Design an enzyme around this catalytic site. Structure first.
Site, PDB file in Angstrom:
ATOM      1  N   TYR A 187     -12.247  -8.263   6.198  1.00  0.00           N
ATOM      2  CA  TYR A 187     -11.295  -9.365   6.040  1.00  0.00           C
ATOM      3  C   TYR A 187     -11.427 -10.374   7.169  1.00  0.00           C
ATOM      4  CZ  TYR A 187      -8.790  -6.338   2.689  1.00  0.00           C
ATOM      5  OH  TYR A 187      -8.448  -5.517   1.632  1.00  0.00           O
ATOM      6  N   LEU A 208     -12.240  11.828  -0.426  1.00  0.00           N
ATOM      7  CA  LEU A 208     -12.801  10.486  -0.428  1.00  0.00           C
ATOM      8  C   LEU A 208     -13.386  10.115   0.924  1.00  0.00           C
ATOM      9  CD1 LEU A 208     -10.990   8.096   1.154  1.00  0.00           C
ATOM     10  CD2 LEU A 208      -9.449   8.570  -0.762  1.00  0.00           C
ATOM     11  N   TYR A 209     -12.894  10.770   1.978  1.00  0.00           N
ATOM     12  CA  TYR A 209     -13.348  10.517   3.345  1.00  0.00           C
ATOM     13  C   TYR A 209     -14.673  11.201   3.714  1.00  0.00           C
ATOM     14  CZ  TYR A 209     -11.198   7.680   6.990  1.00  0.00           C
ATOM     15  OH  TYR A 209     -10.828   6.648   7.820  1.00  0.00           O
ATOM     16  N   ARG A 227       0.829  -1.206   0.000  1.00  0.00           N
ATOM     17  CA  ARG A 227       0.000   0.000   0.000  1.00  0.00           C
ATOM     18  C   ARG A 227       0.865   1.258   0.000  1.00  0.00           C
ATOM     19  NH1 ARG A 227      -4.881  -1.622  -1.758  1.00  0.00           N
ATOM     20  NH2 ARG A 227      -6.055  -2.899  -0.257  1.00  0.00           N
ATOM     21  N   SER A 230      -4.339   5.940   4.135  1.00  0.00           N
ATOM     22  CA  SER A 230      -4.627   5.637   5.515  1.00  0.00           C
ATOM     23  C   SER A 230      -3.443   4.998   6.237  1.00  0.00           C
ATOM     24  CB  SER A 230      -5.866   4.752   5.619  1.00  0.00           C
ATOM     25  OG  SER A 230      -6.069   4.341   6.958  1.00  0.00           O
ATOM     26  N   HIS A 243     -20.683  11.016   4.418  1.00  0.00           N
ATOM     27  CA  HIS A 243     -21.970  11.425   4.973  1.00  0.00           C
ATOM     28  C   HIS A 243     -23.157  10.464   4.743  1.00  0.00           C
ATOM     29  CE1 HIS A 243     -19.659  15.291   4.796  1.00  0.00           C
ATOM     30  NE2 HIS A 243     -20.032  15.262   6.064  1.00  0.00           N
ATOM     31  N   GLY A 272      -8.194   4.711  -0.587  1.00  0.00           N
ATOM     32  CA  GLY A 272      -8.209   4.952   0.848  1.00  0.00           C
ATOM     33  C   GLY A 272      -7.094   4.246   1.603  1.00  0.00           C
ATOM     34  N   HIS A 295     -11.061  14.260  11.820  1.00  0.00           N
ATOM     35  CA  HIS A 295     -11.086  15.722  11.920  1.00  0.00           C
ATOM     36  C   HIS A 295      -9.872  16.312  12.662  1.00  0.00           C
ATOM     37  CE1 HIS A 295     -14.837  15.596   9.840  1.00  0.00           C
ATOM     38  NE2 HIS A 295     -15.189  16.835  10.133  1.00  0.00           N
ATOM     39  N   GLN A 352     -15.558  10.260  12.127  1.00  0.00           N
ATOM     40  CA  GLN A 352     -15.630  11.716  12.069  1.00  0.00           C
ATOM     41  C   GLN A 352     -14.681  12.377  13.092  1.00  0.00           C
ATOM     42  OE1 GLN A 352     -18.925  15.401  12.102  1.00  0.00           O
ATOM     43  NE2 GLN A 352     -19.301  13.476  13.184  1.00  0.00           N
TER      44      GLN A 352
HETATM   45  C1  HEM Z   1     -23.848  14.807  12.507  1.00  0.00           C
HETATM   46  C2  HEM Z   1     -22.841  14.420  11.722  1.00  0.00           C
HETATM   47  C3  HEM Z   1     -22.173  15.337  10.668  1.00  0.00           C
HETATM   48  C4  HEM Z   1     -22.408  16.623  10.359  1.00  0.00           C
HETATM   49  C5  HEM Z   1     -23.441  17.559  11.020  1.00  0.00           C
HETATM   50  C6  HEM Z   1     -21.497  17.004   9.287  1.00  0.00           C
HETATM   51  C7  HEM Z   1     -21.383  18.235   8.656  1.00  0.00           C
HETATM   52  C8  HEM Z   1     -20.249  18.684   7.991  1.00  0.00           C
HETATM   53  C9  HEM Z   1     -19.945  20.046   7.579  1.00  0.00           C
HETATM   54  C10 HEM Z   1     -20.835  21.296   7.813  1.00  0.00           C
HETATM   55  C11 HEM Z   1     -18.752  20.043   6.970  1.00  0.00           C
HETATM   56  C12 HEM Z   1     -18.004  21.267   6.396  1.00  0.00           C
HETATM   57  C13 HEM Z   1     -18.157  21.344   4.882  1.00  0.00           C
HETATM   58  C14 HEM Z   1     -17.320  22.504   4.386  1.00  0.00           C
HETATM   59  O1  HEM Z   1     -16.777  23.258   5.248  1.00  0.00           O
HETATM   60  O2  HEM Z   1     -17.191  22.671   3.138  1.00  0.00           O
HETATM   61  C15 HEM Z   1     -18.252  18.688   6.966  1.00  0.00           C
HETATM   62  C16 HEM Z   1     -17.045  18.287   6.441  1.00  0.00           C
HETATM   63  C17 HEM Z   1     -16.469  17.035   6.497  1.00  0.00           C
HETATM   64  N1  HEM Z   1     -17.083  15.860   6.920  1.00  0.00           N
HETATM   65 FE1  HEM Z   1     -18.996  15.865   7.900  1.00  0.00          FE
HETATM   66  N2  HEM Z   1     -20.739  15.891   8.981  1.00  0.00           N
HETATM   67  C18 HEM Z   1     -21.134  14.852   9.801  1.00  0.00           C
HETATM   68  C19 HEM Z   1     -20.642  13.565   9.812  1.00  0.00           C
HETATM   69  C20 HEM Z   1     -19.512  13.117   9.165  1.00  0.00           C
HETATM   70  C21 HEM Z   1     -19.047  11.755   9.159  1.00  0.00           C
HETATM   71  C22 HEM Z   1     -19.752  10.594   9.876  1.00  0.00           C
HETATM   72  C23 HEM Z   1     -17.903  11.697   8.457  1.00  0.00           C
HETATM   73  C24 HEM Z   1     -17.109  10.383   8.238  1.00  0.00           C
HETATM   74  C25 HEM Z   1     -15.867  10.355   7.773  1.00  0.00           C
HETATM   75  C26 HEM Z   1     -17.607  13.045   7.968  1.00  0.00           C
HETATM   76  C27 HEM Z   1     -16.540  13.462   7.192  1.00  0.00           C
HETATM   77  C28 HEM Z   1     -16.220  14.768   6.841  1.00  0.00           C
HETATM   78  C29 HEM Z   1     -14.940  15.231   6.324  1.00  0.00           C
HETATM   79  C30 HEM Z   1     -13.656  14.409   6.056  1.00  0.00           C
HETATM   80  C31 HEM Z   1     -15.106  16.737   6.096  1.00  0.00           C
HETATM   81  C32 HEM Z   1     -14.045  17.736   5.578  1.00  0.00           C
HETATM   82  C33 HEM Z   1     -13.421  18.409   6.806  1.00  0.00           C
HETATM   83  C34 HEM Z   1     -12.493  19.566   6.451  1.00  0.00           C
HETATM   84  O3  HEM Z   1     -11.989  19.641   5.292  1.00  0.00           O
HETATM   85  O4  HEM Z   1     -12.250  20.427   7.343  1.00  0.00           O
HETATM   86  N3  HEM Z   1     -18.620  13.875   8.424  1.00  0.00           N
HETATM   87  N4  HEM Z   1     -19.192  17.891   7.588  1.00  0.00           N
HETATM   88  C1  LIG Z   2      -3.683 -13.310  -1.191  1.00  0.00           C
HETATM   89  C2  LIG Z   2      -3.927 -12.139  -0.222  1.00  0.00           C
HETATM   90  C3  LIG Z   2      -2.838 -11.809   0.760  1.00  0.00           C
HETATM   91  C4  LIG Z   2      -1.964 -10.549   0.477  1.00  0.00           C
HETATM   92  C5  LIG Z   2      -2.583  -9.195   0.850  1.00  0.00           C
HETATM   93  C6  LIG Z   2      -2.435  -8.027  -0.098  1.00  0.00           C
HETATM   94  C7  LIG Z   2      -3.384  -6.848   0.153  1.00  0.00           C
HETATM   95  C8  LIG Z   2      -3.168  -5.562  -0.628  1.00  0.00           C
HETATM   96  O1  LIG Z   2      -2.610  -5.654  -1.931  1.00  0.00           O
HETATM   97  C9  LIG Z   2      -2.952  -4.676  -2.873  1.00  0.00           C
HETATM   98  O2  LIG Z   2      -3.689  -5.259  -3.903  1.00  0.00           O
HETATM   99  C10 LIG Z   2      -3.667  -4.576  -5.226  1.00  0.00           C
HETATM  100  C11 LIG Z   2      -3.905  -5.595  -6.271  1.00  0.00           C
HETATM  101  O3  LIG Z   2      -3.246  -6.795  -6.149  1.00  0.00           O
HETATM  102  C12 LIG Z   2      -2.431  -3.781  -5.563  1.00  0.00           C
HETATM  103  O4  LIG Z   2      -2.758  -2.819  -6.636  1.00  0.00           O
HETATM  104  C13 LIG Z   2      -1.923  -3.081  -4.449  1.00  0.00           C
HETATM  105  O5  LIG Z   2      -0.680  -2.351  -4.750  1.00  0.00           O
HETATM  106  C14 LIG Z   2      -1.676  -3.994  -3.332  1.00  0.00           C
HETATM  107  O6  LIG Z   2      -1.098  -3.256  -2.276  1.00  0.00           O
HETATM  108  C1  LIG Z   3     -10.026   5.633   4.502  1.00  0.00           C
HETATM  109  O1  LIG Z   3     -10.766   4.636   3.779  1.00  0.00           O
HETATM  110  C2  LIG Z   3     -10.314   3.374   3.815  1.00  0.00           C
HETATM  111  C3  LIG Z   3     -11.010   2.357   3.158  1.00  0.00           C
HETATM  112  C4  LIG Z   3     -10.515   1.044   3.164  1.00  0.00           C
HETATM  113  C5  LIG Z   3      -9.320   0.758   3.842  1.00  0.00           C
HETATM  114  C6  LIG Z   3      -8.823  -0.547   3.852  1.00  0.00           C
HETATM  115  C7  LIG Z   3      -7.622  -0.811   4.511  1.00  0.00           C
HETATM  116  C8  LIG Z   3      -7.041  -2.178   4.554  1.00  0.00           C
HETATM  117  C9  LIG Z   3      -8.193  -3.144   4.857  1.00  0.00           C
HETATM  118  C10 LIG Z   3      -6.354  -2.653   3.339  1.00  0.00           C
HETATM  119  O2  LIG Z   3      -6.988  -3.212   2.436  1.00  0.00           O
HETATM  120  O3  LIG Z   3      -5.100  -2.671   3.305  1.00  0.00           O
HETATM  121  C11 LIG Z   3      -6.958   0.205   5.173  1.00  0.00           C
HETATM  122  C12 LIG Z   3      -7.455   1.501   5.163  1.00  0.00           C
HETATM  123  C13 LIG Z   3      -8.635   1.780   4.496  1.00  0.00           C
HETATM  124  C14 LIG Z   3      -9.122   3.093   4.491  1.00  0.00           C
HETATM  125 CL   LIG Z   4      -7.768   6.565   8.162  1.00  0.00          CL
END
Ligand code: HEM
Ligand SMILES: CCCCCCCCO[C@@H]1O[C@H](CO)[C@@H](O)[C@H](O)[C@H]1O
Ligand SMILES: COc1ccc2cc([C@@H](C)C(=O)O)ccc2c1
Ligand SMILES: [Cl-]
Ligand code: HEM
Ligand SMILES: CCCCCCCCO[C@@H]1O[C@H](CO)[C@@H](O)[C@H](O)[C@H]1O
Ligand SMILES: CCCCCCCCO[C@@H]1O[C@H](CO)[C@@H](O)[C@H](O)[C@H]1O
Ligand SMILES: CCCCCCCCO[C@@H]1O[C@H](CO)[C@@H](O)[C@H](O)[C@H]1O
Ligand SMILES: CCCCCCCCO[C@@H]1O[C@H](CO)[C@@H](O)[C@H](O)[C@H]1O
Ligand SMILES: COc1ccc2cc([C@@H](C)C(=O)O)ccc2c1
Ligand SMILES: CC(=O)N[C@@H]1[C@@H](O)[C@H](O)[C@@H](CO)O[C@H]1O
Ligand SMILES: CC(=O)N[C@@H]1[C@@H](O)[C@H](O)[C@@H](CO)O[C@H]1O
Ligand SMILES: CC(=O)N[C@@H]1[C@@H](O)[C@H](O)[C@@H](CO)O[C@H]1O
Ligand SMILES: CC(=O)N[C@@H]1[C@@H](O)[C@H](O)[C@@H](CO)O[C@H]1O
Ligand SMILES: CC(=O)N[C@@H]1[C@@H](O)[C@H](O)[C@@H](CO)O[C@H]1O
Ligand SMILES: CC(=O)N[C@@H]1[C@@H](O)[C@H](O)[C@@H](CO)O[C@H]1O
Ligand SMILES: CC(=O)N[C@@H]1[C@@H](O)[C@H](O)[C@@H](CO)O[C@H]1O
Ligand SMILES: CC(=O)N[C@@H]1[C@@H](O)[C@H](O)[C@@H](CO)O[C@H]1O
Ligand SMILES: [Cl-]
Lengths: 552, 552
Positions: free
Chosen positions: A324, A353-354, A89, A499, A357, A495, A176, A172
């Site tokens: 898994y 990608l994260y 990865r 990650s 919502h 992701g 954040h 979340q």
């Molecule tokens: C009650 C729950 C939630 C509320 C009210 C909410 C609302 C919001 C709002 C208002 C924004 C800002 C958008 C902007 O500034 O352009 C945001 C951004 C974001 N949200 Fe949510 N959201 C919720 C849950 C979640 C969940 C469960 C995730 C799961 C990963 C998530 C991931 C994100 C991410 C990654 C951002 C961008 C943050 C940044 O760039 O600062 N949110 N959300």
């Molecule tokens: C047989 C499964 C056991 C090995 C775990 C590997 C998990 C992640 O393997 C991923 O799979 C993709 C396709 O093969 C590749 O594109 C990625 O580079 C590779 O990291």
């Molecule tokens: C943020 O979003 C993700 C989504 C899938 C993910 C899967 C892995 C593991 C299971 C992986 O396949 O290597 C890790 C992080 C990950 C993060």
């Molecule tokens: Cl993560």
């Protein structure tokens, strides 16, 4: 006008103009050559025939439970496998980083300026004839239309993996600390200069804020006691800035240190739990080291909580969402004999990608009641009212929604989903297919291949016209999910690299940090290596309610 | 009080307290075990009785010119050798970094706060009974006494390796991009947040300053023409702050952007050469890239200059001061199959050991005149009067002083040398012998072994009383030099690791960066790969005088 606008270099080759109308590809270390890095070297030919698809691999990881049961209990094979996922990865990520919103070539400015999100693919140049470079119409489809046609939720689609609200709010809360867009500058600027898991959402981004949150006795964080329960301190008491509607009662203006955390009681639930946990570790650490002062107790407890977080994130959180049968393992030693960069820079596409919502339910069911979004937002009296034990029990039981598969974005956050489309375009993202190539996936040949159904596919085709012009964000949420999974192929394969790089990149994973003395001895070290979502809740929440990220 | 005050743990084990009066050693990964990590593992036993002393290895490298003459010509052998010097040196430095003035234990504050110099050995704790921890007297010998007896120059001692004034000023100019003490904050704090070779001393530490120095045409830096010669722009024109005495008549207030470079004409000489070199490279890039705009011309030229800088430091500069017959090689590819961290943090002790003021002559001879310090300081008119051509000719011809061997610090900068002693104590440095073990050298057993002679040895022994309490800084300047060499063993074994990690740890040396396209194509790349001190001068200095770091 820029000759590189069509993205002619393949296989991670770099494109450079060599005149007004001419270009050249740099195929260095790609494993290919030719004008566009498409004709492979002999060894490459071989690696390619052997390489299984992400989809084949995922099948193998989600079947044959009996074999995995065995592998899991042979520590040396478990370590072998986990080593390979880690390295395979991480090698997908540029490190040190390259490209950001303003730089489609490698300047010192892009490398040194921590204020930018980095970028896995360079921005489309400002002078290209279309938004995606050369292909498509002069204009991407109206974003409101994309939103309504393929993203907005009709009926709530539950996650078939059984992800619950404990899972959704952990995601979340945890993310954040490193997604903190700096809206003063633009998307693609961050306020989280730590670029990773530094727990700034608990301790504050700056020293100033940290000292305001600190008690300065026994290494502890300030707090208040309401009922018999510990909660974050107030804004009035600490004078830390928080974001709150002006009518909120003094007592419920919790301070905590990620300034946005008071807007969702679910965020504040975890803020409280982690606050409690820091102070619990101070007590253990004080017991072990009567000689220690406040600074060292605070700093050591902080290092321990960083480890606990990574432990939990890998072995419970990622474990859950992977589906898994193999048991993922947090163990820095796996990398001590590997080539690996202990550093990280968070990518803009990782933020994008994260945006999960679709996970959010229609209502929030705190055992007995059912709050609407409007009721739930900026409203901590609910947390006080029900208490932490309730909340845990309730959130453990409520399913979150499916993320991929289309039409599952709650209308209550439609403005947010739209902004994701708009800011993606503003930041000049390359296409879905450009990103699939970047991460070694096969470009989709039709919208119907993307979605696996026909209705959404046709709506998309009328809007975009060409699959090679489909955008990344919309596509992740609309993509065909793995058989009974929460995500499609694209979500996982982009992701995972971001990650795991962010997790193992941490300095606490380096050989010089990863030893007991760093964490106050054997005792502190075990807190990290035995940490879990169950024990986090168990140790810190009144009763000892059971939890998991899975709705059972 | 601190149980770890004696520095009990050996061989790079970490000490931790386990109560008010007890301690524990963490021997993880040291190759040793036991209460103090002094009992070696078997493989460690073999390594030790198979490891040549630094002096044995130095002897081999400074002899058999015949053999090295063969090796330098087998690309294959040159590579594997250079590879080994890079790796073994670098493994000596903690990366990610640990410890600073305020933290003798790991901590996230120590890791994340770039305003600090890092520390190769943690400070002596505030509550230890003696300045060195436990040994010696409650007080260190008067720094004036140490200074006067074994440090001040009586007669000038010339460098036996033949270093000239080109070398001394190159040293000063190059090191002053990463040694920039923040006096506002304290010693231990730096203003070079880039912690390495970023050329901020040419471009500015901040973006505000860089923009002020920039022409915004053709990627160029602003300049003036005086006579027909190119010089830095002025403070009044650019508005960039510099440090100058009030009597300086504008017009000679050259800007350049390391704010301190006005106070020595030898510094302004190089500043002028690198500014010309930057604009020269822009011309070359423009010719290759008619279609590029100002920004990419600027940024690419900057990356190329960084590369040139690294190339020259290794193949001309380090080459000269090493005295080796083996020909060093700047080649990032040597590390692509090795474990290596592309990151750096500059150490406080690295700053300390680079205080090479003995290099400086009693007078600065610019063909025909003999200038004193008072006349040389902050006096750019001397530069305007003689020109760059004269200056290079003169500086190449005048020898530098020897650094080790005692009693060669110019009286003119006695206050500086005294500050170095005083600040070391202020920052609580551990002893010379502690630093020697940390870098795998045998502790000195008498002052007389340290100096290699008798008179200073006896002077020191009356001051320090015990060799295990001798300080690092005074020791480096008094140490017995290698045969006819400029430095003693401690200087080289400490300096090399800091220096080489500082050079190779630069992102442009990383696989993603090290490729033709990073530097605008094969011609930009070749400038890096063919750069030398002689070529730097030849391209940018009127005639094209011969230069060298060695007196002819
Ligand atoms: C009650 C729950 C939630 C509320 C009210 C909410 C609302 C919001 C709002 C208002 C924004 C800002 C958008 C902007 O500034 O352009 C945001 C951004 C974001 N949200 Fe949510 N959201 C919720 C849950 C979640 C969940 C469960 C995730 C799961 C990963 C998530 C991931 C994100 C991410 C990654 C951002 C961008 C943050 C940044 O760039 O600062 N949110 N959300
Ligand atoms: C047989 C499964 C056991 C090995 C775990 C590997 C998990 C992640 O393997 C991923 O799979 C993709 C396709 O093969 C590749 O594109 C990625 O580079 C590779 O990291
Ligand atoms: C943020 O979003 C993700 C989504 C899938 C993910 C899967 C892995 C593991 C299971 C992986 O396949 O290597 C890790 C992080 C990950 C993060
Ligand atoms: Cl993560
Ligand atoms: C005319 C020539 C020189 C003069 C006038 C000079 C003088 C000074 C002065 C006044 C300081 C500041 C002292 C303090 O802050 O306590 C200093 C620091 C320093 N000097 Fe020199 N010096 C000269 C040449 C050199 C040379 C040739 C070197 C070679 C390495 C050198 C290495 C250093 C270093 C590394 C510092 C620390 C800088 C910092 O931490 O910011 N100096 N010098
Ligand atoms: C150890 C035994 C190996 C068997 C591997 C089974 C691979 C079948 O896997 C299939 O691959 C497709 C990928 O394009 C997916 O669309 C399917 O959903 C998936 O079931
Ligand atoms: C979730 C409510 C807001 C969206 C409605 C306005 C946009 C119309 O969208 C349409 O909705 C139909 C019903 O789901 C689908 O059959 C169509 O394919 C879709 O295009
Ligand atoms: C291939 C054969 C190797 C032998 C090389 C000669 C080693 C001599 O090295 C000696 O080590 C001493 C260490 O204290 C120094 O004092 C001497 O100056 C030095 O000559
Ligand atoms: C003569 C063999 C080829 C030249 C490479 C060796 C030069 C640098 O190698 C050094 O040698 C010292 C003594 O063993 C070690 O203490 C250092 O850690 C090591 O970096
Ligand atoms: C700052 O001071 C030094 C002194 C000696 C050095 C020697 C090397 C090479 C020749 C080496 O011994 O590895 C490198 C840097 C050095 C820096
Ligand atoms: C050898 C090769 O494949 N060259 C192709 C060329 O045919 C095409 O015109 C160009 C633009 O995309 O891309 C490249
Ligand atoms: C970015 C950051 O935290 N910088 C801090 C600074 O605020 C503080 O003045 C100093 C001493 O504590 O440590 C450093
Ligand atoms: C922002 C912060 O809290 N830093 C403080 C600052 O007031 C002080 O000047 C500095 C000196 O080290 O460090 C401390
Ligand atoms: C502003 C708002 O919606 N107020 C809500 C209220 O409806 C609810 O009764 C209470 C439960 O404690 O939470 C708050
Ligand atoms: C096993 C062993 O060597 N124990 C030593 C002890 O003898 C000594 O008093 C001390 C010195 O710091 O370090 C410990
Ligand atoms: C520390 C630093 O250089 N920060 C810069 C900031 O000044 C600038 O506003 C931004 C956009 O250009 O890039 C970042
Ligand atoms: C996006 C952004 O913040 N741009 C900034 C600008 O505001 C500021 O004028 C300049 C000063 O360094 O740095 C850049
Ligand atoms: C204040 C001072 O020292 N002025 C000097 C002067 O002695 C010298 O003649 C002149 C020309 O090079 O440089 C300046
Ligand atoms: Cl150096």
């Amino acid at each position: 006008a820029n000759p590189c606008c069509s993205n002619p270099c393949q296989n991670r080759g770099e494109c450079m103009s060599t005149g007004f109308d001419q270009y050249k590809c740099d195929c260095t270390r790609t494993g290919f050559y030719g004008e566009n890095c498409t004709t492979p070297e002999f060894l490459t030919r071989i690696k390619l025939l052997l390489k299984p698809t992400p989809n084949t691999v995922h099948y193998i990881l989600t079947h044959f439970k009996g074999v995995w049961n065995i592998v899991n209990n042979i520590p040396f094979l478990r370590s072998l496998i986990m080593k390979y996922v880690l390295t395979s990865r991480s090698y997908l990520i540029d490190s040190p980083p390259t490209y950001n919103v303003h730089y489609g070539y490698k300047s010192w400015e892009a490398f040194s300026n921590l204020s930018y999100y980095t970028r896995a693919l360079p921005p489309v140049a400002d002078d290209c004839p279309t938004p995606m470079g050369v292909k498509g119409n002069k204009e991407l489809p109206d974003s409101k239309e994309v939103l309504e046609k393929v993203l907005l939720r009709r009926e709530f689609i539950p996650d078939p993996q059984g992800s619950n609200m404990m899972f959704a709010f952990f995601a979340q809360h945890f993310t954040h600390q490193f997604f903190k867009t700096d809206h003063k500058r633009g998307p693609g600027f961050t306020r989280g200069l730590g670029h990773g898991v530094d727990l700034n959402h608990i301790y504050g981004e700056t020293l100033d804020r940290q000292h305001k949150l600190r008690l300065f006795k026994d290494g502890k964080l300030k707090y208040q006691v309401i009922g018999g329960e510990v909660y974050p301190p107030t804004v009035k008491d600490t004078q830390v800035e928080m974001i709150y509607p002006p009518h909120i009662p003094e007592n419920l203006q919790f301070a905590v240190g990620q300034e946005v955390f008071g807007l969702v009681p679910g965020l504040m639930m975890y803020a409280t739990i982690w606050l409690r946990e820091h102070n619990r570790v101070c007590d253990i650490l004080k017991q072990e080291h009567p000689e220690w002062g406040d600074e060292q107790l605070f700093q050591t407890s902080r290092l321990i909580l960083i480890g606990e977080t990574i432990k939990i994130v890998i072995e419970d959180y990622v474990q859950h969402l992977s589906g898994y049968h193999f048991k993922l393992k947090f163990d820095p030693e796996l990398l001590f004999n590997q080539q690996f960069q202990y550093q990280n820079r968070i990518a803009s596409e990782f933020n994008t990608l994260y945006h999960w919502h679709p996970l959010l339910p229609d209502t929030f069911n705190i055992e007995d009641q059912e709050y609407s979004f409007k009721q739930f937002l900026y409203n901590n009296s609910i947390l006080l009212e029900h208490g932490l034990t309730q909340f845990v029990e309730s959130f453990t039981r409520q399913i979150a929604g499916r993320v991929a598969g289309g039409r599952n974005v709650p209308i209550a956050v439609q403005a947010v989903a739209k902004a994701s489309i708009d800011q993606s375009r503003e930041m000049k993202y390359q296409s879905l297919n450009e990103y699939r190539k970047r991460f070694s996936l096969k470009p989709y040949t039709s919208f119907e291949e993307l979605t696996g159904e026909k209705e959404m596919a046709a709506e998309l085709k009328a809007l975009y016209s060409d699959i090679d012009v489909m955008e990344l964000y919309p596509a992740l949420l609309v993509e065909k999910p793995r058989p009974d999974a929460i995500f499609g192929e694209t979500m996982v394969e982009l992701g995972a690299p971001f990650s795991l790089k962010g997790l193992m990149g941490n300095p606490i994973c380096s050989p010089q940090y990863w030893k007991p003395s760093t964490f106050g001895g054997e005792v502190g070290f075990k807190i990290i290596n035995t940490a879990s979502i169950q024990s986090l809740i168990c140790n810190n929440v009144k009763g000892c309610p059971f939890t998991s990220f899975n709705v059972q």
